[PDB]
Amino acid sequence: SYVFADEFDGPAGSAPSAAKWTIAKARETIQDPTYWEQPGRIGQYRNDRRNVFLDGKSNLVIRAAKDGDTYYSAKLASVWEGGAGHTWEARIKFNCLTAGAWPAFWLGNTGEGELDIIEWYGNGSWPSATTVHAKSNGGEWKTHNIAVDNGWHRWRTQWDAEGARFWLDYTDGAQPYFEVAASSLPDWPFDQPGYTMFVVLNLAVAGSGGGDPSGGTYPADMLVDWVRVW
């Protein structure tokens, strides 16, 4: 009994469900861009079957690849949104841990609050990590470094009014590798009545976290076998 799920079944080369996902048509605009955030260096997003498609073997493929002078990739945001008191999990394979790449699985909200379940940074500086943000600019957060490899893994979070918890490859009764108490973040928005969040799966190229892709190996793929919330 899932409140939201996508098993990404369907024929090779087809698009993910338009009923479940919004596919980004552009990379967000960066207000005061660092070098790799500059228009013309930042990677782009588009709804193109070369960059986001089902492999016909039960996986969503998000692919970053150079087209002309621009790196293109993809971002999906769930149309559905879910509130407190659920468990959220995706099975993911990062075939894209290369210079310039910046994959992420996260729960978003356009007002405040963000649960970055896992991000890996290709810029050669930032360690991969799980992060909880509160506050409008996300300027109040707790973060936890965790290593990412290219194997299949399940990334899980639970959150409610009292806190947020994270697991890697969850097994029965395992302790979260990271948890955050509401009381540890003064502006904790997750306890607001009716507060909900959408799911995001994306593979960015360049920008701050991605950095220089010139030495990286492209095409680079992020595979998603499923996303489930219950």
Binding-site positions for Ca(2+) read: 7, 58, 225
E strands of 40-85, at which residues? 44-45, 52-54, 60-67, 70-78
Closest CA to 158 of 176, 183, 140, 131: 176
Asked if 208 is part of the footprint of ligand 211 (rule: CB under 6 A), the reply reads: no
Asked if 81 is part of the footprint of Ca ion (rule: CB under 5 A), the reply reads: no
Q: Which is nearer to ligand 211, 1 or 214 (CB)?
A: 214
Q: Which residue among 52, 62, 74, 99 contacts ligand 211 (CB under 6 A)? A: 99
Q: Which residue among 38, 124, 169, 174 contacts ligand 211 (CB under 6 A)? A: 124
CB 6 to ligand 211: min, Å: 29
d(CA 203, CA 92): 12
Q: Which structure tokens are listed for 58?
A: 């039960």
Residues placed in the known binding site:
7, 58, 225
Q: Which residue among 36, 105, 106, 121 contacts ligand 211 (CB under 6 A)? A: 121
Asked if 164 is part of the footprint of ligand 211 (rule: CB under 6 A), the reply reads: no
d(CA 142, CA 151): 26
- Within 8 A by CB and 6+ apart from 21, the residues are 6, 76, 77, 78, 79
CB 124 to ligand 211: min, Å: 3
Q: How far is CA 190 from CA 22, 39, 104, 111, in A?
A: 23, 34, 21, 11
Q: Which is nearer to Ca ion, 160 or 225 (CB)?
A: 225
Asked if 122 is part of the footprint of ligand 211 (rule: CB under 6 A), the reply reads: yes
List the single partner that 160 binds among Ca ion, ligand 211, none, CB under 5 to 8 Å by kind.
none
List residues near Ca ion by CB under 5 A. 7-8, 58, 225-226
